[PDB]
């Protein structure tokens, strides 16, 4: 099921990094990883929680559709792309935490807990503030657990409406060309050590789908680009992308 | 509120070509073109008919979803990408005419005629073979009529299910990056003169949608890349994409 290829460790050590890459081949039902222990270590999801958050908000009617405008509250925050109006698409593209905090408040602790357990999402513990539990609370998820959750979302197998899953997968669109399509979500956990960066999603090919989930130590914000770069080095090495 | 900007003709003249580019700014509700007369001139849709054809097939249940396999009939044809199995996604990516001909045969003349009237699609005339009318029959559509049809599709306003419109817009995915998303469909009309190439779709920005419809004379197949190249030249000039 899960095959450890320690050869991939060079992709982190060459960048003075520490992390895990997890790949799942949907057609052969095989998984690969550089580090089995870290692949099964759970971390704060950070902005990768935007995928289950958006799913629940859509299914419960908190969000009508991907065109609904969420107004900026006129308060300037550190990330410049946050200080403007957003919809479901740009909220995910720019990881607009205040938009998702409002989602969680409208969803409520009771319904958030039931959906996360139905999703089998991580440890299913929303301990902490309902608007911040994925940033400084008790919810934790591993790379392999991200893969399992994403595989259900791809097949529309999650216990929400098919429309909700289609819309969220549309918002996950990150990159597309004649060779591949990448639907993914970035993450950056900073409020509790260890500071890590996430990148989870999948690569759609013509005749296969390659799921991926990676996290890596992120002591400073200068290495955020390594999240996508290290993953693409593994995808290139594995003949998945040219 | 159309605006004719003959400056764009240089993008055609540089390649010793002739054609029309039509842009629609959805936010401002204003249009732009290099040739107003040709913008309203109707041609055979050719493979751009894959958009309404897939919509009808999905809504009628002829296609269950985007994963359903349409097996190759065994006949070797000129374009090698046609000689394999395809789903709704790869059929649109490779413009696999035999797949779409099979769609039209299962839809039938009566249901195809009424769907096109409901769509207000072009001259709504499906005269000819039920599996070739968009290639050598009587159906005609202009660039401005293509944009009219695409704007309804973008807002889920066509008189089919919202699900079928979402799936087709997923199949239209052509290119995406951090700057823009393009959902579009190419076309090459070769059976009846004049030989023309098509490119219709839209460019999704964070804050706006730019619908485009272009057609150009295509005497030989070696200029097909000019369909996207000239459109991007126009999009770059108007500061729509970097
Ligand atoms: C989610 O992981 C976070 C949020 C919890 O802070 C957001 C913030 C960022 S990048 C912030 C720094 N930008 C430039 N220096 C991301 C991200 O994934 O890029 N998500
Ligand atoms: C639709 O417009 C046609 C069909 C009617 O033949 C298909 C064929 C092509 S050409 C593919 C590349 N051939 C040589 N380079 C297209 C197209 O739009 O590219 N659609
Ligand atoms: Cl978030
Ligand atoms: Cl959608
Ligand atoms: Cl076709
Ligand atoms: Cl999409």
Select from A107, A104, A136, A138 the least CA-distant residue to A121.
A138
Nearest ligand (C-alpha, residue B227)? 2
Radius of gyration of chain A (CA): 17
Under 8 Å between Cβ of B219 and B225: no
Nearest ligand (C-alpha, residue A49)? 3
Please say whether the dihedral angle defined by the alpha carbons of residues A140, A145, A150 and A155, taken in this order, is positive or negative. negative
Q: Dig out the tokens for B193 from the structure.
A: 């003169």
Backbone phi and psi for residue A30, each to the nearest 5 degrees, phi listed first:
-125, 145
Using CA atoms, how far apart are residues A211 and A204, in angstroms rounded to an integer? 9
Task: Report the gap between the CA of B175 and the closest CA in chain A (Å).
Answer: 5
Task: Report the gap between the CA of A140 and the closest CA in chain B (Å).
Answer: 29
| Interface residue B90 vs chain A (CB under 8 A) | yes
| Interface residue A159 vs chain B (CB under 8 A) | no
Q: Which residues contact A87 (CB under 8 A, 6 or more apart)?
A: A66, A67, A68, A69, A70
Using CA atoms, how far apart are residues A82 and B65, in angstroms rounded to an integer? 36
Nearest residue by C-alpha to atom 1 in ligand 1? A47
Under 8 Å between Cβ of B88 and B68: yes
Nearest ligand (C-alpha, residue B228)? 2
Q: Which residues contact B190 (CB under 8 A, 6 or more apart)?
A: B46, B218
Given resolution (angstroms): 2.3
Between helix A50-59 and helix A143-154 the angle, nearest 10°, is: 40
Q: Please state, as a whole number, how many other Cβ atoms lie within 10 Å of the Cβ of residue B105.
A: 14
Q: Please state, as a whole number, how many other Cβ atoms lie within 10 Å of the Cβ of residue B240.
A: 18
| Interface residue A205 vs chain B (CB under 8 A) | no
Using CA atoms, how far apart are residues A24 and A10, in angstroms rounded to an integer? 20
Q: What are the start-end ranges of the H helices in chain B?
A: 9-13, 36-39, 50-59, 88-93, 97-107, 109-118, 133-136, 143-154, 162-171, 226-237
Select from A5, A78, A1, A22 the least CA-distant residue to A216.
A22
Name the experiment that determined this structure: X-ray
Q: Between the CA of residue A111 and those of A52, A56, A62, A101, B180, what are the distances in Å?
A: 12, 9, 12, 15, 35
Structural domain harbouring B113: 2-238
Backbone phi and psi for residue B193, each to the nearest 5 degrees, phi listed first:
-75, 145
Q: Which residues contact A106 (CB under 8 A, 6 or more apart)?
A: A57, A62
Closest atom, ligand 1, to C-alpha of A186: 18
B181 CB neighbours in chain A (<8 A) are 173, 176
Counted domains in chain B:
1
Task: Report the gap between the CA of B42 and the closest CA in chain A (Å).
Answer: 29
Q: Which residues contact B25 (CB under 8 A, 6 or more apart)?
A: B31, B32, B208, B210
What is the SS3 assignment for A105-158? HHHCHHHHHHHHHHCCCCCCCCCCCCCCHHHHCCCCECHHHHHHHHHHHHCCCC
- The structure tokens 């998820």 sit at A141
B170 CB neighbours in chain A (<8 A) are 166, 170
**Which of B82, B172, B187, B227 to probe ligand 2 with, by most ligand atoms within 8 A of CB?**
B187
Q: Do A206 and B163 touch (CB under 8 A)?
A: no
User: Does the beta carbon of B46 sit less than 6 angstroms from any atom of ligand 2?
Assistant: yes
Under 8 Å between Cβ of B75 and B94: no
| Interface residue B237 vs chain A (CB under 8 A) | no
Using CA atoms, how far apart are residues B38 and A169, in angstroms rounded to an integer? 38
- The answer to whether the bond into B132 is cis (omega within 30° of 0) is no
**Catalytic residue at A221?**
no
| Interface residue A206 vs chain B (CB under 8 A) | yes
Closest atom, ligand 2, to C-alpha of B185: 18
- The structure tokens 């076309």 sit at B187
User: Does the beta carbon of A192 sit less than 6 angstroms from any atom of ligand 1?
Assistant: no
User: Does the beta carbon of B224 sit less than 6 angstroms from any atom of ligand 2?
Assistant: yes
Q: How many residues does chain A have?
A: 242
Radius of gyration of chain B (CA): 17
The beta-carbon neighbor of B176 closest among A90, A167, A175 is: A175
Burial (CB count <10 Å: 0-12, 13-18, 19+), residue A199: buried
> Residue B188 forms beta bridges with which residues?
B197
Q: Which residues contact A171 (CB under 8 A, 6 or more apart)?
A: A54, A66, A88, A89, A91, A92, A93
Report the catalytic residues of B: 47
Select from B178, B154, B174, B150 the least CA-distant residue to B89.
B174
Between helix A97-107 and helix A50-59 the angle, nearest 10°, is: 40
Q: Please state, as a whole number, how many other Cβ atoms lie within 10 Å of the Cβ of residue A47.
A: 21
Under 8 Å between Cβ of A197 and A184: no
Using CA atoms, how far apart are residues B66 and B158, in angstroms rounded to an integer? 19
Q: Dig out the tokens for B74 from the structure.
A: 């065994």
- The structure tokens 């706006």 sit at B208
The CATH number for B206's domain is 3.40.710.10
């Amino acid at each position: 099921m899960w095959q450890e290829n320690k050869s991939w460790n060079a992709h982190f050590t060459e960048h003075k990094s520490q992390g895990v890459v997890v790949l799942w081949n949907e057609n052969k039902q095989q998984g690969f990883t550089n580090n089995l222990k870290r692949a099964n270590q759970a971390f704060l999801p950070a902005s990768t929680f935007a995928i289950p958050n958006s799913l629940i908000a859509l299914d419960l009617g908190v969000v009508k559709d991907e065109h609904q405008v969420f107004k900026w509250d006129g308060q300037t925050r550190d990330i410049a792309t946050w200080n403007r109006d957003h919809n479901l698409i740009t909220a995910m593209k720019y990881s607009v935490v205040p938009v998702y905090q409002e989602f969680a408040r409208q969803i409520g602790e009771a319904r958030m807990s039931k959906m996360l357990h139905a999703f089998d999402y991580g440890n299913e513990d929303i301990s902490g503030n309902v608007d911040s539990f994925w940033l400084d609370g008790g919810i934790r998820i591993s790379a392999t657990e991200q893969i399992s959750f994403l595989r259900k979302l791809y097949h529309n197998k999650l216990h929400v409406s098919e429309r909700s899953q289609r819309i969220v997968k549309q918002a996950m669109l990150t990159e597309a060309n004649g060779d591949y399509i990448i639907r993914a979500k970035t993450g950056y956990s900073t409020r509790i050590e260890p500071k890590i960066g996430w990148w989870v999603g999948w690569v759609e090919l013509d005749d296969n789908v390659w799921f991926f989930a990676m996290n890596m130590d992120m002591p400073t914000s200068d290495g955020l680009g390594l999240r996508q770069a290290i993953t693409k080095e593994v995808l290139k090495q594995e003949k998945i992308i040219p």
